[PDB]
Symmetry: C2
Subunit: 179 residues, 2 copies
């Protein structure tokens, strides 16, 4: 059973900075001998990360709910394509299959995955690393805003501190590595 | 069965402004003859909303994972209390029991809930209203950041327009009301 890293990332934009990020993540995961777990779609960053893992010989696991199969273009090239009945089952599968989590820039669907993984880690329901990887300032406004929730007690310092925020792929993967 | 409104909200702080808002919401839900659904805990805003609803003889439904029963002071005085195995089952039960959703100020756990409900509605998995009720600019920074995701295509204008953002209880409940 290879170490597995789950990547949550955009399903929409085709911006080169986004796709190039996602591709480097996918390559680097594969090059470490690690399995990539992702949303199993061939669009946007989700397509880019899995394609790049495969180009380097890496094992890819794609987990997609049946309702998104035609919309997010189910990744028929994943070595394991897991099609789930529901979206919550999709997230449970991605969690169960993975040893660490990386969130790349994305929109509301990425954010719901991220907040779910974060809250679960913080409550002690799993002890897997959660990395937010953002080289081009995508989540700057979100993080400034989350930090303002600490002095007012809505978010604990401990919750903030259990999130690993980095701007480069190499630091993201070091923070995901098996101890 | 009775029209049911789910209220996602803080589980930490005890600010009078927060507790007063959550109490007014619970009282006003019961005053309409509606059911309150919530995370079934007697802490912070979560406890204030369910206590206010029940105080006016409103039907209250609490949904809580077994692992939070102690730390969130499971609301055993609720008319119905569902104890689930997982956080995902918790959120599934809250969704299926409810006709409309209100998010009040909260932290990462509220944002987890809110972003999941938003995503599911946007993708067409339900057509239930989603209201963000914020009389004190709690979410101003989050909304400003989310709107900055629209011109670059991470979040559609359609997704933003889905959200009903209001600053008062009456407008929130009007937007949750049965057609």
């Amino acid at each position: 059973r290879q170490w597995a890293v789950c990547v949550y990332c955009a399903s929409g934009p085709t911006h080169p900075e986004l796709l190039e990020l996602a591709a480097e993540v996918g390559s680097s995961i594969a090059a470490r001998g690690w399995t990539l777990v992702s949303g199993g779609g061939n669009v946007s960053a989700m397509g880019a990360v899995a394609q790049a893992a495969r180009a380097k010989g890496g094992h890819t696991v794609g987990v997609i709910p049946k309702a998104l199969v035609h919309r997010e273009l189910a990744d028929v090239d994943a070595a394991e394509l897991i099609v789930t009945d529901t979206m919550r089952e999709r997230k449970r599968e991605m969690e169960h299959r993975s040893d660490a989590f990386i969130a790349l820039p994305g929109g509301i669907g990425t954010l719901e995955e991220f907040f779910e993984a974060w809250t679960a880690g913080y409550l002690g329901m799993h002890d897997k690393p959660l990395i937010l990887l953002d080289p081009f300032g995508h989540y700057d406004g979100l993080l400034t805003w989350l930090r303002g929730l600490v002095p007012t007690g809505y978010v604990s310092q401990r919750a903030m501190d259990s999130l690993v925020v980095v701007d480069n792929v190499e630091a993201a993967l070091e923070a995901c590595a098996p101890e």
